[PDB]
Design an enzyme around this catalytic site. Structure first.
Site: not given
Ligand SMILES: *CCC(=O)Nc1cc(Nc2ncc(Cl)c(Nc3ccc4ccccc4c3)n2)c(OC)cc1N(C)CCN(C)C
Length: 286
Positions: A25, A26, A134, A138-139
């Site tokens: 959505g 980087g 922040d 979500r974080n």
């Molecule tokens: C809230 C969204 C989310 O974090 N989703 C997510 C995250 C991870 N694992 C993971 N591990 C380390 C780091 Cl740095 C991240 N970073 C990240 C930031 C923002 C983000 C936005 C949208 C989607 C992903 C994402 C990742 N994330 C993970 O490991 C399997 C899965 C998910 N998912 C797939 C949740 C469902 N998705 C949001 C639709």
């Protein structure tokens, strides 16, 4: 201040494999980091113009300078074209999505433990003179359902106050909205909103209210409502995080103590119906 002797590790692109997209959505990818000649596979997340490269290196600077069990680990950066931020993979996603997807299966013990762990991570950041700016559900990423860590340091600043662009209005303290001051106590406000997110199983704060109206609502004395599962003991802590006087809000060290007391008898403070080969995690690759 003290000299920041943290190490910035440069990782070769040839050491990463099995890259699939986690979200965009980087963009963030899931993958495996295999250090050359180490017989080790590290599950990692890879986050991906001069302006973009400057901001991502700022976050790399912050994450390389923190080391705490409740703060996300920076493994290194990759200098391929757009600079990539390589961190520990948290395979259960963010806490916001986790509480929404698993509402009917989250007990009081997990909720209060998460509050303790988030407060421990923020207290460490305060020890490092870091203001997150922040903090939100979500974080907060989920390594296991029993272990969460704070993430996303794109707005973090090293400090007293910080004077600042675009910001999450519905998580900010009033003094941050009106005069753009950010302190560790403004982070405490965001902690209270984050707890409210968890106790409501992922509700949106001030749902339907435009962000331009939040400052006037807070000035009138209005706050987020008491979540149904919350005893007055828990909601009082959240209300104290939303005081006008920043020095009257709780300290993160104090949030640790209070929520840890509650975690020893969780059903007294949260009322929830039905409450009764070579893969190595980054935490073990030092
Ligand atoms: C809230 C969204 C989310 O974090 N989703 C997510 C995250 C991870 N694992 C993971 N591990 C380390 C780091 Cl740095 C991240 N970073 C990240 C930031 C923002 C983000 C936005 C949208 C989607 C992903 C994402 C990742 N994330 C993970 O490991 C399997 C899965 C998910 N998912 C797939 C949740 C469902 N998705 C949001 C639709």
């Amino acid at each position: 201040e003290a000299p920041n002797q943290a190490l910035l590790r440069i990782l070769k692109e040839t050491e990463f494999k099995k890259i699939k997209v986690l979200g965009s959505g980087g963009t963030v990818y899931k993958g495996l980091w295999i250090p050359e000649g180490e017989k080790v596979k590290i599950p990692v997340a890879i986050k991906e113009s001069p302006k973009a490269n400057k901001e991502i290196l700022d976050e790399a600077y912050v994450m390389a300078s923190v080391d705490n069990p409740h703060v996300c680990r920076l493994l290194g950066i990759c200098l391929t074209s757009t600079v990539q931020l390589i961190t520990q993979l948290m395979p259960f996603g963010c806490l916001l999505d986790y509480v929404r997807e698993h509402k009917d299966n989250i007990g009081s013990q997990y909720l209060l433990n998460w509050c303790v762990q988030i407060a421990k991570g923020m207290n460490y950041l305060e020890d490092r003179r870091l203001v997150h700016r922040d903090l939100a559900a979500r974080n907060v990423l989920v390594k296991t359902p029993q272990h969460v860590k704070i993430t996303d340091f794109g707005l973090a600043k090293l400090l007293e106050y910080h004077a600042e662009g675009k910001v999450p209005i519905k998580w900010m303290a009033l003094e941050s909205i009106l005069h753009r001051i950010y302190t560790h106590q403004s982070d405490v406000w965001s902690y209270g909103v984050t707890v409210w997110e968890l106790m409501t199983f992922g509700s949106k704060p001030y749902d339907g209210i435009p962000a331009s109206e939040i400052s006037s609502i807070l000035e009138k004395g209005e706050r987020l409502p008491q979540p149904p599962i919350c005893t007055i003991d828990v909601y009082m802590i959240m209300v104290k995080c939303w005081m006008i006087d920043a020095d009257s809000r709780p300290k993160f060290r104090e949030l640790i103590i209070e929520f840890s007391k509650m975690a020893r008898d969780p059903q007294r403070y949260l009322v929830i119906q039905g409450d009764e080969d070579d893969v190595v995690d980054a935490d073990e690759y030092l």
